[PDB]
Design a protein around this ligand. Structure first.
Ligand SMILES: CC(=O)N[C@H]1[C@H]([C@H](O)[C@H](O)CO)O[C@@](O[C@H](CO)[C@@H](O)[C@@H]2O[C@@](O)(C(=O)O)C[C@H](O)[C@H]2NC(C)=O)(C(=O)O)C[C@@H]1O
Ligand SMILES: CC(=O)N[C@H]1[C@H]([C@H](O)[C@H](O)CO)O[C@@](O[C@H](CO)[C@@H](O)[C@@H]2O[C@@](O)(C(=O)O)C[C@H](O)[C@H]2NC(C)=O)(C(=O)O)C[C@@H]1O
Ligand SMILES: CC(=O)N[C@H]1[C@H]([C@H](O)[C@H](O)CO)O[C@@](O)(C(=O)O)C[C@@H]1O
Ligand SMILES: [K+]
Ligand SMILES: [K+]
Lengths: 256, 258, 257, 258, 257
C-alpha cells in the first residue's frame, strides 16, 4: 500500500555520487582498462582471465535514517571524462603512416539503473562452454540452453568487481522496484557518441506516479560504461571505461 | 463481432509474461542460438539451403483463463531482447580484427521483429530467388514462380508452428492481420552494428484508432518474434547467424462482444 | 473549385487496398524484381543504358465508385513487402571475405510513394544530358546542358508503367497540388537498407486546410519506387533489387463547386 | 521600424515560386552542375584554386507586387532539392566500386543551405587557409591575415551577385541577418552518403518569436541556396563537385509598419 | 540568496553578442585554428604532448551593465562560425585515392558550450595518469592511477584562456549550479563532421524553477570547445582543426535578497 507523499522542508533529500568503472585493472597503472584481449584457439576452450572481463558497477548509498520510505523521483546522469578519449598520442596504433593514434572505438555498453534494492540479473552466455574465472560470479550449471535462456541463472548485483558484463543482463521478469536503461552498440569501428549536460533530467516515476522505494533506507545505483577499446601500437586491444555521475532526488513516502 | 464494453472489477484483468527463444538453426548440441555457417550457391537455381542454416520465426500460443461472449483484449506490451551483453564476448575463437587484435563482434544483417495478436500471425511469402529449394521440415512458399520474387498472392500462411517458417521467405501480410499488431526492422549490410536498447520503462499500447486491442479467439494469445542480431565470424572466416530471446509482458482486460 | 462539406453516413467512405510491383528492368524470365547487371560507359557522350538496366517508376490508376461529389483521399498505410527476402545471403552472392557469407543487398536506394487525385506530375533532371535513353522508355526530350540542373521543357505525367526511368524524373514541386508525395534518396555504395514494417502507422493526407487529394474522374493514382540497393553476384557484377509496396487508402465523399 | 497589424482581405496575400540553379564551376559547355576536377596544391602556401573548381552561393532577388507604409512579410517556405534521382546514374564514366561492379555514386562532403530574407543575405568570411589565393572573378575575403582562419571581422559582405561568392570562404553572418531566416548543414567526409528527402507536405514557418517574418525592403524578396551534394568520381579517380537546383515557394502577407 | 521578482520596463533587458575563437595550439604564425601535428609516444609511460599539440577550452568573461539586482541569463543562440571552410579539400591535403580530392577534416570531435554567472567548474579525468602535461598548461596535479577514472582532488575553474587542455578536463557535474553546459564527444578517426547553422534556434537557460544563471559581479561567462576533427596533410601527418563559436545571450534584471 503506497499512500501519500510527505511535504515540508524536511521531506526531500538528494544523493550525488560517481560510480567508477570496473574494466579489469590488469596492473597498478591501468585503472579503467582491461587486460589486452586474447582469442581462444577453439570455441570450447574459451577461458577468459578475470582482468580481461569488464564487470557491472554498483553502489549502495545510505539515506537519512527514517512507515516512511525514501522514494527516488528524478535522476541526472552522465559519463565523466569524455574528453580523455581525445588522447590520441599515448602509444596507440597510427591510423596510417605519420598519422595520429586510433581513438577508443568499437563495441560499447552504456547502462545505468536506480533502485530501492539490488538490481536483479538474468544470465545469458554467448558460449555456454566458456570457463569463467575465479573471482567472478557467473551463471552456474550452464547448459547449451544458457546461450538463449536458462531461467536457473538468477542473481543480484550485490558485489562490485564481480558480475561480468558479458554474462548478465537486467532481469525483465523482476526489477519492479528499479528503473534501468541500457544500450549495446556492437562493431569494431563504432564511434563513441557521448553527450554531457546538466540540463537533462529523467523521471523515475512509474505510470502510477511511484518511484523506486528504498528498502532499509538504501539507494542502489548500478552502471556500466564500456566506451570501446583502446588499440596499442602493437595492435593489442583493451576495453576502456569511464565513471558515471548520478544525482538522485528523493522524497518521503508513507506506506502501509 | 460488435465490440461492446470493457468489464471492470478485480477479476477483469490478467498479465502474460514470457520469453520466446530464437530459432536460428541450432546445427549441433552446442550451438543453440546460432545457425550453421553460411555457404553460397554457385547459381540461383542451385540455391539449396540446409534447414539448420535458416533462421525461422518464433511463435508462442499462450492459453488464457477460460471465459464463457467475453474475450481477452491485449492492451499493452513491454518487450526487449534478452542477453544483449553476450555480444561483448570477443574472445571465443573469433576472427581478429587485425594482427594481435580482439575478435570481431557480431554484426551485419539483422531483423528484429515482434507481434501480439488474438490469433496466428498471417504471412505473405516473398522470395529473393524463386528457384531456391527450401529444405524438408520447413514450411515455405509452394508453387513459386518468378512473380514470387515481387508478389505472388498464392503465398499465404499462418505462423502456426515453431522452427518451421523461415524468416527469409515470409513477412507479415499487410492485407490481413486486423487482429494483430506487428513491428519489425530489417537493417541490412555486412558491417552494420547491432544497436540494442534495454529498459523496463517503455510500454507499447496495442489499441487501434478505435480503442480496441487484439481480441483473443478461443482464449489464446499469440506472440511472435525474430531477433537475428547479425552474424558471428569464426577464426576461419565462416559466418553464422546469432539470435537472442525476446521478453514479452502483455496486459489484458476482459471485453464483451456480440 | 470551391471545396464544400464532407458527406457522412455508411455510404460515404470507401477504401482502396493494393500492391504496386517494382519495375527494376527484369532482364530475363528468372529475374523479376532485379535489373540487368550495371555496365559503365567509357565517357559521358557514350552513356547508352539499355532498357532492362533502368529502374522505372511504378504507377496504378485505381478506378473508384462512380459519383458535384469527389472522392477525397484522407489516410494512407503503406509498407515495403518482403523485407526479409534480403536475408538470402546464400544465393550466388559475392562473399564478404574468404569463407564468409554472401553480401546482402546494399548501396544506393530510392524509396518513394505518392497518392493523388490525378497522375503524378514529373520534372526531368539528367545526371548527364548526353545520355542516350533507350527505345521503350519515356525520357526528357531535346535535352541540353541546362537539363543537368533545370530545363523547364521536361514536363511529364507518370501515366504509364515500365516507362519512366527513375534516374530521369522527379516529382515536379512546381505542380502536384492534388497529390501528396514522399521520397528519400540514400546514395553510396555501402549504405545499409533500413526497412521498417508495422500495421500501426498511418499517414494523414489532408493539407493545411483539411483537404486531401480529390479524385478527378473517380480515379485514384498511386505511385512508388522502392529500389532497395544493389545485389552483387559472385563475379562482382551488380544489379538493382526492388520490392513491392502495399497501399491502403481511406477515402470519403466531398462536395465541390 | 514599428511593426503594426497584418492586412486581411483576398489580395492581402501573394506567393513566390521559383528555382535557383547551382553554380558549381561549370568547367565546360557540357558540365553544367559540376565543378572542375579537384586538384591539390603542393604546399599550404601555394593553394590557388581555379574559379571553375569553386562552388558559389546562389541568389535570386525577386520583385514583389508594388505596395506604396505597407511591406510584404514572408510567412512560410516550402523548399526541395530538384533532381535527387539523377544520382542513380551509376553507369556514366564512373569509377567501378570493385572489379565488374557499378559506378561509384555521388558521395562525400556536402553543404545544403537555404535562406529567405527581406534584403540580401549578410556574409562573414572564414578561410580554411588564409594564404589561399582566390581567383579573378570571385569575391573573397580581402586583406586576409592568419586571424581570418578563425575570425576576422573585416570580412563582411552581401550575397548580391551570382557566380561570385565561393561557398568555402563565406558563411551567413550570425551577428547580422535579423531580417533573414537561414538554415544550413555541412556534412563532411569523403564517404558520406547523400540523404535527400523530397515531399510537398513540409512547410517551414518564417516568423520569429514575436510572430514577425522577414519584411521585404523595396518590395524585394531574397532567396539564397547552396546544394553541393557530394563529389562525382570518374573512371580515372578524379573528383568533381555535383550540385542540384533548389525549389522555393514562399507565402507572403501585407504588414503595416511605421 | 532568495530569488524574487523579475524587473520590467525598457531598462530591464540587455543582450550580449560575441564570438569565442578556438585555441587548438597554434604551432606557428600561419596556423591559427590548427594544432601542431600529432606525434605518438614510443611507450605508454612516456606520453609527453607538447603544448601546441593540445587543444584547450575557450572562455570569455563579458562585463554587463553595472547594477540587490542581478542579470539573469534567459536565452542563448549559438552556432559554429565558418563551417564551409571545411570544403577546402585542395590545400595540400592527402588524396583519398589516386587522383582524388584531399581528405576533408574528419574524425574525433568535441563540440561544447556553456553560459554561466561565474566561471565554469571543471573536474579532471586523465586517459593516462603518467602523461607528462607541458609547461604553460593547467592540468590535474598529483595525478595517481585513480585519476584515470575519478580523483576528486582534480578541481579547477575555467578562468584562463589557452590553458586548460580539453583532454584533461570536463565540466564538474557535482558543481555548476549557476551554469548551463552542453557538449558532445564524437570519437573515431573517420567520423564525419555534421555541423548545422541557423539563426532560428534558441536554447532557454532557465532551470526547472524558471531561474537562469545569475551573473555575479555583473559578469557573464561564456565557454566553448569546437574541435571539428583532424586535417590530414599530404605527408599523412594530422592536426586538430577548430572553429569559432557565436553566442547571443538575452538577459533580464532579477531582484535577489
Ligand atoms: C595501455 C597499456 O598499458 N598498453 C600496453 C599493453 C598493456 O599493458 C597490456 O597489453 C595489458 O594486458 O602492453 C603492451 O606490451 C605487452 C606486455 O608488455 C606486449 O609486449 C605483450 O607482452 C607479453 O609478455 C604479454 O603476454 O603480455 C607477450 C605478448 O606477446 C605481447 N603482445 C604483443 C601484442 O606483442 C602491448 O602492446 O600489449 C604495450 C602497451 O603499450
Ligand atoms: C597545415 C600545415 O601547415 N601543414 C604543414 C605541416 C604543419 O605545419 C606541421 O605538421 C605543424 O606541426 O607541416 C608539414 O611539414 C612538416 C614540417 O614543416 C614535416 O616535414 C615534418 O617536419 C619536421 O621537421 C617536424 O618535426 O615538424 C620533421 C618531420 O619528420 C616531418 N614530418 C613528416 C611526416 O614528414 C607536415 O607534413 O607535417 C607540411 C604541411 O603542409
Ligand atoms: C561457434 C562455432 O561452433 N564455431 C565453429 C564452426 C561452427 O561449429 C560450424 O561452422 C557450424 O556450421 O566450425 C568451424 O569448423 C569453422 O567453421 O571454422 C570452427 C568454429 O570454431
Ligand atoms: K505551384
Ligand atoms: K545582431
Amino acid at each position: 500500500e503506497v499512500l501519500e507523499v510527505k511535504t515540508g522542508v524536511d521531506s526531500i533529500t538528494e544523493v550525488e555520487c560517481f560510480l567508477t568503472p570496473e574494466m579489469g585493472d590488469p596492473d597498478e597503472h591501468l585503472r579503467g582498462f582491461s587486460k589486452s584481449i586474447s582469442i581462444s584457439d577453439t570455441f570450447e576452450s574459451d577461458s577468459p582471465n578475470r582482468d580481461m572481463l569488464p564487470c557491472y558497477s554498483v553502489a549502495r548509498i545510505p539515506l537519512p535514517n527514517l512507515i516512511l520510505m525514501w522514494e527516488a523521483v528524478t535522476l541526472k546522469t552522465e559519463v565523466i571524462g569524455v574528453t580523455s578519449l581525445m588522447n590520441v598520442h599515448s602509444n596507440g596504433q597510427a591510423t596510417h603512416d605519420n598519422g595520429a593514434g586510433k581513438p577508443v572505438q568499437g563495441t560499447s555498453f552504456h547502462f545505468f539503473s536506480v533502485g530501492g534494492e539490488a538490481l536483479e540479473l538474468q544470465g545469458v552466455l554467448f558460449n555456454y562452454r566458456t570457463k569463467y574465472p575465479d573471482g567472478t560470479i557467473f551463471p552456474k550449471n550452464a547448459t547449451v540452453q544458457s546461450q538463449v535462456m536458462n531461467t536457473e541463472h538468477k542473481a543480484y548485483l550485490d558485489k562490485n568487481k564481480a558480475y561480468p558484463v558479458e554474462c548478465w543482463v537486467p532481469d525483465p521478469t523482476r526489477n519492479e522496484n528499479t528503473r534501468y536503461f541500457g544500450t549495446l552498440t556492437g562493431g569494431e569501428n563504432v564511434p563513441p557518441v557521448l553527450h554531457i549536460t546538466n540540463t537533462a533530467t529523467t523521471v523515475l516515476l512509474d505510470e502510477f506516479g511511484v518511484g523506486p522505494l528504498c528498502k532499509g533506507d538504501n539507494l542502489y545505483l548500478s552502471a556500466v560504461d564500456v566506451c570501446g577499446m583502446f588499440t596499442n601500437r602493437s595492435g593489442s586491444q583493451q576495453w576502456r571505461g569511464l565513471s558515471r555521475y548520478f544525482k538522485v532526488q528523493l522524497r518521503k513516502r508513507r506506506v502501509k
